[PDB]
Amino acid sequence: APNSALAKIQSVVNSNAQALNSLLQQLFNKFGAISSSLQEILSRLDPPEAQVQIDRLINGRLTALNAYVSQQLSDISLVKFGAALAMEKVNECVKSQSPRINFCGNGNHILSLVQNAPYGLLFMHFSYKPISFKTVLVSPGLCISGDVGIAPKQGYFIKHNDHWMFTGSSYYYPEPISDKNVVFMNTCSVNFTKAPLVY
Amino acid sequence: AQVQIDRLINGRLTALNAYVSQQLSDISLVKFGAALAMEKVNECVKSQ
């Protein structure tokens, strides 16, 4: 179907073909001379004034090459930026998973794979997508026992069966509070929920 | 008058080409700055 990446690859090919066609069309521009054909100039006009008309064509064609070279230097700078980004995505999404949030595509990024593409690389970013949600009352921390503070690790403290338990932030699964899913603090912050009988 | 107008057209077209080449280079610096700003939003604002 119509796809953004396939369109991006075809845009690379089409932009190159359009630039090459535009450079070829610059050979048929008169540039203020009698004709754009050097044979037509030399088959109709004598050397002293033929040299003036050929000078008009040389100026036009050298100007077209200078403009094309300036555009090509700019485009290759953008390709260097893209290739540096693609090497960085290989290193930090494919060979490993760098702790950078939206670097390897949007969403909760799990892992990435790479495939070859015309003039580049195709990255397949795989993300953890929630399907259904549950509204739940959560606490971002608790004050327990001798006023010791605890904060949940990658999750929340929830009331389940009238007990304080933990759930992971990206999947609802009540499980017991332990040192595995908790950051300890020697003093609880104010507005941490008071749970004197926890642990 | 054609010779005079041809000199003006050559000057004005050269001026446009020079402006276009500068504008391409400046927009490359703006793409790099925008990519850095998106990276700073992602890695300083939405997360650390």
Added chain:
Amino acid sequence: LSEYGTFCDNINSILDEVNGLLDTTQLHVADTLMQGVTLSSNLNTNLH
């Protein structure tokens, strides 16, 4: 100028491509700001 060839068509094409990159970039920035944002419907500017 018409006898000069497709010089203006090239200048328009380059500036339109540059302006298309600026528009595309502003969408990537706006997308990056909005990515993953969830707000409550009970939010109000006047009271909170």
Added chain:
Amino acid sequence: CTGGSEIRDLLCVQSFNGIKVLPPILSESQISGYTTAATVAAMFPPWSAAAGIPFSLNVQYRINGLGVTMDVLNKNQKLIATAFNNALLSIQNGFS
């Protein structure tokens, strides 16, 4: 540019010579709405742009990640908050 004003803006002279600046596809008011949504996405539940926790707790855990004990951090929450909003006011007054 079509007003009767004696003062001719140099932009009007440029536009009548074919040189004009078109507006961006999203207005700066829309982008201000997006930066406002991204900012309020850190204050209130679900805190979708603040690691899913209250903004003050995110500040506290970030300061503790530098090597600051949590004890002084949750004892000095008000001083940390006033330092934070004074740094905000210092940025605001720095444009004058």
Added chain:
Amino acid sequence: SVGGLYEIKIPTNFTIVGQEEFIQTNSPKVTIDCSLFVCSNYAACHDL
């Protein structure tokens, strides 16, 4: 926060979604014979 508890929507089910991204790392290697382009076969042009 009612008591000390906030309301959050936590996922109860999930899936894996895939997203493509093409990154251009290469371009066609254009070579121009500037002499053949500017002056073709013609010695009168090459001298100038």
